[PDB]
């Protein structure tokens, strides 16, 4: 059988398991360690769930690529360069940092809801909003219309 | 006479639980029905 009869496409999804259609990245092609740094927990806190979801799978995809290269190197060549292993570990650090941020965020939301569930604390927070920023001397004319629109959306379920 | 084999018996001292206290890992499935006997059941 001859491969000249084939039409293996250039957009074939398995190509995502390789870096720029290369068998195994060399030292120069691999991103240097100096130029790089894993995300920081505060940085992830400024990210929406969709964006964090997107980052997670992007991390996983390169993790698969690096895993493929480590295995090829450590199962054929046998070298202990472990440059790919270190890169994967750095990605692994970011992955759990993402997981920590999500848990802390979810816990914070639950804590706030429970705190606002007490009548005394809810009344204090509401009246503080009412007296201070609401019931102004007409400084905001239509801005208060926006203020309320975000008020109903946040505290209550009115959109 | 003195009741040596009944007095020498000892049982575990369960802690006092408040409503704001940690839940024990393992608890009986049925409500207690009798006051605990001071000397417990004879083990001999």
């Amino acid at each position: 059988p001859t491969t000249s009869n084939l039409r293996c496409p250039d957009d074939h999804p398995l190509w995502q398991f390789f870096s720029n259609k290369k068998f195994i990245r060399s030292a120069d092609d691999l991103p240097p360690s100096s130029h790089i740094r894993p995300w920081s927990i505060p940085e992830l806190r400024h990210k929406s769930f969709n964006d964090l979801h997107s980052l997670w799978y992007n991390c996983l995809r390169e993790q698969n690529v690096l895993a493929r290269e480590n295995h090829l190197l450590k199962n054929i060549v046998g070298s202990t360069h472990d440059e790919f292993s270190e890169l994967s570990n750095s990605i692994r650090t970011t992955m759990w940092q993402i997981r920590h941020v999500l848990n802390e965020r979810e816990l914070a939301y639950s804590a706030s809801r429970e705190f606002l569930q007490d009548e005394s604390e809810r009344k204090k927070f509401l009246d503080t909003l009412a007296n201070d920023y609401f019931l102004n001397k007409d400084i905001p004319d239509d801005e208060v219309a926006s203020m309320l629109t975000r008020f109903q959306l946040a505290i209550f379920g009115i959109s | 006479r003195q009741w040596r084999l009944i007095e020498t018996r000892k049982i575990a001292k369960q802690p006092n639980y408040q409503v704001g206290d940690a839940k024990p890992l393992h608890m009986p499935k049925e409500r207690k029905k009798f006051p605990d006997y001071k000397y417990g059941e004879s083990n001999i």
């Binding site: 491969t3 084939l6 293996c8 999804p13 398995l14 995502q16 398991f17 979801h53 997670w56 799978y57 996983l60 995809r61 993790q63 698969n64 895993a67 493929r68 295995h71 992955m95 993402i98 997981r99 999500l102 | -």
Partner: protein, 104 residues
């Protein structure tokens, strides 16, 4: 009117035609999986239309199909598992013997 196997074929054809899953999506949603799969070079007994992976040990055949389609867009029609053994090994004769890891 039709056999079960014919219906399975129709469902897969329908999924491909409509640009949707060619399988049935389960209800247990994993939002942040941590599983990694290693592409493997073809063997002699393979054809240019197949691909072999080193999947996690706790990985169903259905799991890989969903894993490939949803993360990579690759659609796997037939998936088949080969679970290997672990030979006993010892770095020296003085140490305890333990089996090499099983690789799925």
């Amino acid at each position: 009117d039709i056999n079960v196997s014919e219906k399975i074929y129709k469902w897969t054809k329908a999924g491909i035609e409509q640009g949707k899953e060619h399988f049935k999506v389960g209800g247990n949603k994993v939002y942040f999986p941590k599983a990694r799969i290693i592409l493997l070079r073809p063997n002699a007994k393979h054809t240019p239309y197949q691909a072999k992976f080193i999947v996690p040990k706790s990985f169903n055949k259905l799991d890989l199909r969903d894993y490939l389609y949803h993360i990579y867009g690759l659609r796997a029609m037939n998936i088949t598992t080969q679970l290997l053994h672990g030979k006993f090994n010892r770095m020296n004769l003085q140490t305890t013997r333990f089996r090499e890891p099983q690789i799925k």
